[PDB]
Design a protein around this ligand. Structure first.
Ligand SMILES: CC(C)c1cc(Oc2c(Br)cc(CCC(=O)O)cc2Br)ccc1O
Length: 250
């Protein structure tokens, strides 16, 4: 079980700092978080079918905080030398492809079993129902279940940062030009990640294989969100969609 090489530590230091600098965690979330009033997302008539409707008030609060979150994903990627050297067209495709995947991971690692909330951008704590009714539908359930599941992993900033890099460098996104180059970058991240894991010595058998399953869960959330986005455009007024929100998931 090899630990990271000297070159891998350099990479690790790079991605970790990149993540830390864009994860909005200077003044830790547990203390900074405000709980979205229970009133918001609350259905007035219990017996009216939920169907695929969207709570527009909840939706409004979410699109308000989502833009600065989207920008942090971009800044994260833009702090990686490998990414920066990719053609702009590929950069765009990779960002549109992993944006939700990374934001969902960042929210999932901030799951709180006490209140049963996910803390978004380390500032707004929301419940399963709020995020569900507010527009995500079952994707909210997926993110919360993932959050619950990660709680025992004890993932540090390096491991979260590495997961983000792996998702960022996905050569299977439709339309990519530098497929080979992107895959090579992912392999380098994957390898450095596996070695960091061995170095960490987590007390759990097959931790690496299990971590990889979480990446798969995030890929599913990402794609499922693309679908839920189309529904939002149909259920919500065009005015509640910020230009950045549209540009990234268009
Ligand atoms: C607008 C609709 C409901 C909507 C909501 C939505 O919820 C989130 C998540 Br899962 C994470 C973060 C940031 C986490 C962070 O970076 O700390 C912010 C937000 Br608003 C994601 C996509 C989407 O289309």
């Amino acid at each position: 079980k090899p630990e990271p090489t000297d070159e891998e530590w350099e990479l690790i230091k790079t991605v970790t700092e990149a993540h830390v600098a864009t994860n909005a965690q200077g003044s830790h979330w547990k203390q900074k978080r405000k709980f979205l009033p229970e009133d918001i997302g609350q259905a007035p008539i219990v017996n009216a079918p939920e169907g695929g409707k969207v709570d527009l008030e909840a939706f409004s609060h979410f699109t308000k905080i989502i833009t600065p979150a989207i920008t942090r994903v971009v800044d994260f990627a833009k702090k990686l030398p490998m990414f920066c050297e990719l053609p702009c067209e590929d950069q765009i495709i990779l960002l549109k492809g992993c944006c939700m995947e990374i934001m969902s991971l960042r929210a999932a690692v901030r799951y709180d079993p006490e209140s049963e909330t996910l803390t978004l951008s380390g500032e707004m704590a929301v419940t399963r129902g709020q995020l569900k009714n507010g527009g995500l539908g079952v994707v909210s359930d997926a993110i919360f279940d993932l959050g619950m599941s990660l709680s025992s992993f004890n993932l540090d900033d390096t491991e979260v940062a590495l997961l983000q890099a792996v998702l960022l460098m996905s050569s299977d996104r439709p339309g990519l030009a530098c497929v080979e180059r992107i895959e090579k970058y992912q392999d380098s991240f994957l390898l450095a990640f596996e070695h960091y894991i061995n170095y960490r010595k987590h007390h759990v058998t097959h931790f690496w294989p299990k971590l990889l399953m979480k990446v798969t869960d995030l890929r599913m959330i990402g794609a499922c969100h693309a679908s839920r986005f189309l529904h939002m455009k149909v259920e919500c007024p065009t005015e509640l969609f910020p230009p950045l929100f549209l540009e990234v998931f268009e």
